[PDB]
């Protein structure tokens, strides 16, 4: 693709500041109208901002929710934008796409893959995972559902890996939910209940904040 | 500050069904010189929005030859021919007649199979969870359709709950149905001053609900 790409995207404590860029190569950066957007992940889009170009003294705009947090800069120099966010706040958090205007038909036509801006002031934390196994019964059927419970993380991802040596799995792998303030998440696997529990299931929880990898057999 | 409503916001679809994604702003776009600047986005989950067609009916380039735009003034219409996969994932109308760009809910084509009906499992606290001081009795609805569903918690038979977590899955490719797990946290102490936990599946193919239970003071 032509692409628009930007990066400095990460974890700020809230009250900080991001300089968050974006490169567009592309026949005639120079002319084009450069765009900010927001997409919480929590819903939809919001337009933070944008700027016109040089012919149009740079006539810089804003949605009036980040009015005076935010700067937009360019450099055609370098065919660069900018995103000055200062002085942010949780709700701030959000994917960040840089939108650049395809002047000759119409405005905010192509948008790169975006980046994550993360305000919240809680911590690194790890992982509680926790393993759930039927209780008593046994195998009530054909199949049987295992599963991990992965308790308590900062921030965003973790990546549940099943050691089920061949069997018949189906790994629901379930989104992640804000919970007193850090994340939970659970992830489920059946089995084939003439292999349960001779079998060795284990379930794998990785963190890259904080290079954690809990294993736990369910039993 | 113009709201873009669409209509409707999920949208089950055969994959050779005709689609519509109905879209409906609260003031005039008629620009007073320019001319409907009313544009729809299409966005594959993980991944940036892409650009459809632009001032109603103006496709873009690449827009395959199944994409239909039409609509006067307040009125737009989104129509996609013969539903192909390849163009399952949220449908954006936006507006930059007025600032600011405002877009809408977004609208997801989904995926059309028949009913199905879940499969229901209670899990209790492992030993491992409640020697930190917490409980969490976990239960995994898998495998249903559609995604109409609702879960009841009885602890006690004592009438719901509000610790509870619920997470769906998007849509299974594979046996194209939906996962969803409803998580109850508790305290230790409650824990173990209550009996039996229940979880109470509520769904369209059973009148009579599908309820999984388990006893704590067993296993």
């Known amino acids: 693709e032509v692409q628009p790409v930007e990066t400095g995207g990460g974890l700020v404590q809230p009250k900080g500041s991001l300089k968050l860029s974006c490169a567009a190569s592309g026949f005639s950066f120079n002319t084009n109208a450069m765009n900010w957007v927001r997409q919480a992940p929590g819903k939809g889009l919001e337009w933070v901002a944008r700027?016109?170009?040089?012919?149009?003294?740079?006539?810089?705009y804003y949605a009036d929710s980040v009015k005076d947090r935010f700067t937009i800069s360019r450099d055609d120099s370098q065919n660069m934008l900018y995103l000055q966010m200062n002085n942010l706040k949780t709700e701030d958090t959000a994917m960040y796409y840089c939108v650049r205007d395809q002047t000759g038909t119409a405005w905010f036509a192509y948008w790169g893959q975006g980046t994550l801006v993360t305000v919240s002031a809680a911590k690194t934390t790890p992982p509680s995972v926790y393993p759930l196994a039927p209780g008593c019964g046994d195998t009530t059927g054909s199949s049987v559902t295992l599963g991990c419970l992965v308790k308590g993380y900062f921030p965003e991802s973790v990546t549940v890996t099943w050691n089920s040596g061949s069997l018949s799995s189906s790994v629901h792998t379930f989104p992640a939910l804000l919970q007193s303030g850090l994340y939970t998440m659970s992830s489920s696997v059946t089995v084939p209940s003439s292999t349960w529990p001779s079998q060795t299931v284990t379930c794998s929880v990785a963190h890259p904040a904080s290079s954690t990898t809990v294993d736990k057999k369910l039993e | 500050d113009v709201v873009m409503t669409q209509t409707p916001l999920s949208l089950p679809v055969s994959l050779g069904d005709q689609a519509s994604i109905s879209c409906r702003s609260s003031?005039?776009?008629?620009?007073?010189?320019?001319?409907?600047?009313l544009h729809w986005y299409l966005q594959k989950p993980g991944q940036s929005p892409k650009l459809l067609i632009y001032?109603?009916?103006n496709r873009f380039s690449g827009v395959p030859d199944r994409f239909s735009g039409s609509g006067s003034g307040t009125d737009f219409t989104l129509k996609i021919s013969r539903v192909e996969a390849e163009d399952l994932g949220v449908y954006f109308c936006s507006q930059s007649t007025h600032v600011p760009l405002t877009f809408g809910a977004g609208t997801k084509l989904e995926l059309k199979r028949a009913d199905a009906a879940p499969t229901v499992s209670i899990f209790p606290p492992s030993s491992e969870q409640l020697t930190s001081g917490g409980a969490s009795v976990v239960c995994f609805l898998n495998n249903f359709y559609p995604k109409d569903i609702n879960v009841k918690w009885k602890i006690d038979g004592s009438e719901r709950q509000n610790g509870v977590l619920n997470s769906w899955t998007d849509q299974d490719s594979k046996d194209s149905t939906y996962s969803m797990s409803s998580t109850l946290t508790l305290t230790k102490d409650e824990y173990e001053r209550h009996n039996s936990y229940t979880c109470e599946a509520t769904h369209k193919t059973s009148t009579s609900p599908i309820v999984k239970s388990f006893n704590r003071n067993e296993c």
């Open positions: 001032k109603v009916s």
């Open positions: 700027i016109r170009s040089k012919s149009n003294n740079y006539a810089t």
């Open positions: 003031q005039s776009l008629v620009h007073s010189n320019g001319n409907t600047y």
